[PDB]
Design a binder for this molecule. Structure first.
Ligand code: CL
Ligand code: CL
Ligand code: K
Ligand code: MG
Ligand code: MG
Ligand code: MG
Ligand code: MG
Ligand code: MG
Ligand code: MG
Ligand code: MG
Ligand code: MG
Ligand code: MG
Ligand code: MG
Ligand code: NA
Ligand code: NA
Ligand code: NA
Ligand code: NA
Ligand code: NA
Ligand code: NA
Ligand code: NA
Ligand code: NA
Ligand code: NA
Ligand code: NA
Ligand code: NA
Lengths: 194, 65, 81, 56, 46, 119
RNA sequence: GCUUUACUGCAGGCUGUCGCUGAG
RNA sequence: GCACGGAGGCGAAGAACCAUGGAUUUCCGAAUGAGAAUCUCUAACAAUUGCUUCGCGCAAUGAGGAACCCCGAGAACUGAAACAUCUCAGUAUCGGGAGGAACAGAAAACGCAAUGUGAUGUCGUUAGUAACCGCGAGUGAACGCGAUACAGCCCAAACC
């Protein structure tokens, strides 16, 4: 039969309807008063967290991060620029908000490593994402066959190098075929053309 | 030279510290004579006095005192 | 670990302090305080130190003018080394 | 007053000094920042790619 | 001016580096102080 | 709170938790929201419990209506660790289900009745 | 470098619309 | 020691010298008790985190490195015989970060359309071809093929 989890998931398909709607209307009031990075005891979306690698276990951490909505916060040019480069208003960053959130969280927990993240809504001026981080130095995790991979030395600061799921999709690596000529194996090896 | 490693290892933790202080003193006075321009020097000693002190401290380390 | 006394600062002025005011002058470690200079001097020469004046010399070392008590004789202490 | 020789006479202020971190006489004692290694400003050592030819 | 303990030590050092190559070193090498700084013609750090 | 549409009097909650304890010793009980859910879905649930101090609420939100369309009786419990302890756990439990009571079927039946009347 | 009712654009201001946004 | 002086010393108790391993290893320095132009003032993982016996008790991070690598920010001279799109160029430079290599990687692929291929890099080629472009100047792949090397797996959930 349906897992209880399927009900959490099912509710988040429409965060604007039913109970979830009223719940969000309430929570955001408190969230808007919390910091930029708030560690939380439990994922707001269990099914999603668990689906992304979460586990009720020592060394597993979750944190809700708030990030502003919109385009790049850019300063107008202070020297000569051809029209093409005189823009300010329509310029958007190449890193999506979710990735920005994942980075702010990781910096907050210097010792932890980002495992994944998911969205938990937004109001008119900010978006909230919950990030799952892992303690690569805790034996509880070092002895976990489903997570100890994140303990390896080459997984250090993985979020800052775009090795995150959100980091990889944002890098245009989803497609294995047509369209990923200038993304795989890396954006940089392809002369930054994607 | 005049003071070898075996002789140092055969001493007791207390004989080393004693031998140590003695050397330091010999050295201090050697330097005092040097400071007074005292020519009755023997460049080799004032130099060996440093190594002797090094060897002893080294052994006190290996032995645990 | 560093030692307090380096060597007797023997010079004309140094002698004068010894013959005339019962003072011994030493080149000491600049990390050393007057009190530490006083002790060291007592423990190394078996004497009683009454006063200690210091100076951080332009030679990069500290100089100490240690005055002995009437019971002690600077000339005799200095003379045995 | 000439901006040359006559104005050089007032120059008895101390600014850049021997730096505790890098040893260069570049530690601005007024700003408490080394113009050479970045001491006082950055934990990381000051360095730029323009300090050498681009392909080198 | 007012010099600190460290500054003084540095000045002291510079003054010493300002000594000449001992006569014996000339004989020992069978034959200049490339650091001769004059207090007037030269300038020190800090 | 958003999933709680009626208030259960302390005394009732007490009888309820008491019944649950005998339920685990005499009959059988399901501990955990996932296991409670399948009970309601498999119909094998006689009475289900739901804590009111659940954060996030999503974990339980569905219990009420899911139960209503399955004809299964459910009751609320202020504390979360009481329900878990009453279920025999060393930890708390957001939801529990009495999978066939035992030496409490009368009580359970009554507790259910009391709630229905409590609307 | 400077000017303007030169060409082309870019900030900024005003104004409509959408989101935040809900009850009769 | 370079360093060929003077004096003196060490070495058959096997020195010098070389290799590996060990001892010592001041102060400032990420610099971390607090402050400071390498010093000072009165027990210190400062700061941020994880675990937690909730006590800094057990741990982590910080900074460096010749370039290489990955993730972001991103010019202008110049070319177009002017110049605005275009070009120089995703270059210079800037921000963040990893490793001895990075990154990528077991198809919601390819589409010589097939009764076909079979994770991913890279090299040779495909090809200055397709595609872009005041359709100007310029710009510019991929599939496939021949090679190198080869390696495939773990969760979430169902049922417990
Ligand atoms: Cl990370
Ligand atoms: Cl094919
Ligand atoms: K241009
Ligand atoms: Mg590569
Ligand atoms: Mg004084
Ligand atoms: Mg001027
Ligand atoms: Mg002189
Ligand atoms: Mg400090
Ligand atoms: Mg041109
Ligand atoms: Mg033309
Ligand atoms: Mg191009
Ligand atoms: Mg193709
Ligand atoms: Mg398994
Ligand atoms: Na981190
Ligand atoms: Na692109
Ligand atoms: Na001296
Ligand atoms: Na001068
Ligand atoms: Na060493
Ligand atoms: Na630490
Ligand atoms: Na602690
Ligand atoms: Na031209
Ligand atoms: Na021109
Ligand atoms: Na064009
Ligand atoms: Na073929």
């Amino acid at each position: 039969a349906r897992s209880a989890y399927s009900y959490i998931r099912d509710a988040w398909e429409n965060p604007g309807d039913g109970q979830l709607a009223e719940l969000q209307w309430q929570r955001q009031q408190e969230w808007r008063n919390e910091g930029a990075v708030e560690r939380i005891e439990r994922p707001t979306r269990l099914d999603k967290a668990r689906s992304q690698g979460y586990k009720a276990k020592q060394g597993v951490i979750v944190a809700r991060v708030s990030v502003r909505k919109g385009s790049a916060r850019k300063r107008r040019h202070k020297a000569g620029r051809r029209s093409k480069r005189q823009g300010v208003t329509r310029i958007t960053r190449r890193k999506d908000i979710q990735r920005v959130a994942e980075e702010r969280a990781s910096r907050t927990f210097p010792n932890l490593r980002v495992l994944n993240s998911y969205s938990v809504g937004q109001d008119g001026r900010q978006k909230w994402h919950e990030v799952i981080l892992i303690d690569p130095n805790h034996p509880a995790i070092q002895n976990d066959d489903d997570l100890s991979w994140i303990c390896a030395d080459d997984q250090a600061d993985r979020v800052f190098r775009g090795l995150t799921g959100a980091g990889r999709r944002n890098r245009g690596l989803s497609g294995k075929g047509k369209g990923s000529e200038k993304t795989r194996p890396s954006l940089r090896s392809n002369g930054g053309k994607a | 030279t005049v003071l070898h490693v075996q002789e140092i290892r055969d001493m007791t933790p207390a004989e080393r510290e004693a031998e140590l202080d003695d050397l330091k003193t010999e050295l201090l006075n050697a330097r005092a004579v040097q400071a007074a321009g005292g020519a009755p020097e023997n460049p080799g000693r004032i130099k060996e006095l440093r190594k002797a002190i090094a060897r002893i401290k080294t052994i006190q380390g290996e032995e645990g005192d | 670990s560093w030692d307090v006394i380096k060597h007797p600062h023997v010079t004309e002025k140094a002698m004068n302090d010894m013959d005339f005011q019962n003072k011994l002058q030493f080149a000491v470690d600049d990390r050393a305080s007057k009190g530490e200079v006083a002790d060291a001097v007592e423990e190394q020469y078996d004497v009683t130190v009454e006063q200690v004046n210091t100076q951080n010399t332009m030679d990069g070392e500290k100089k100490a003018v240690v005055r002995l008590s009437e019971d002690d004789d600077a000339q005799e202490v200095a003379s045995r080394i | 007053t000439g901006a040359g020789t006559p104005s050089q006479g007032k120059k008895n202020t101390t600014t850049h000094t021997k730096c505790r971190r890098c040893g260069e006489k570049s530690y601005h004692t007024k700003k408490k920042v080394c113009s050479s290694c970045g001491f006082g400003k950055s934990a990381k050592r000051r360095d730029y790619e323009w300090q050498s030819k681009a392909g080198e | 001016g007012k010099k600190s303990k460290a500054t003084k030590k540095r000045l002291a050092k510079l003054d010493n580096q300002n000594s000449r190559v001992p006569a014996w070193v000339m004989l020992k090498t069978d034959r200049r102080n490339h650091k001769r700084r004059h207090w007037r013609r030269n300038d020190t750090d800090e | 709170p958003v999933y709680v549409d009626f208030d259960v009097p302390a005394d009732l909650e007490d009888d309820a938790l008491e019944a649950l304890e005998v339920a685990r010793d005499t009959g059988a009980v399901k501990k955990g929201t996932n296991e409670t859910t399948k009970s309601i879905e498999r119909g094998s649930a006689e009475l289900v419990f739901v804590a009111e101090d659940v954060q996030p609420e999503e974990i339980v939100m569905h219990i009420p209506e899911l139960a209503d369309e399955k004809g299964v009786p459910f009751i609320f419990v202020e504390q979360q660790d009481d329900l878990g302890h009453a279920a025999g756990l060393e930890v708390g439990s957001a939801a529990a289900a009495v999978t066939d009571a035992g030496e409490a079927d009368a009580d359970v039946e009554d507790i259910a009745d009391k709630v229905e009347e409590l609307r």
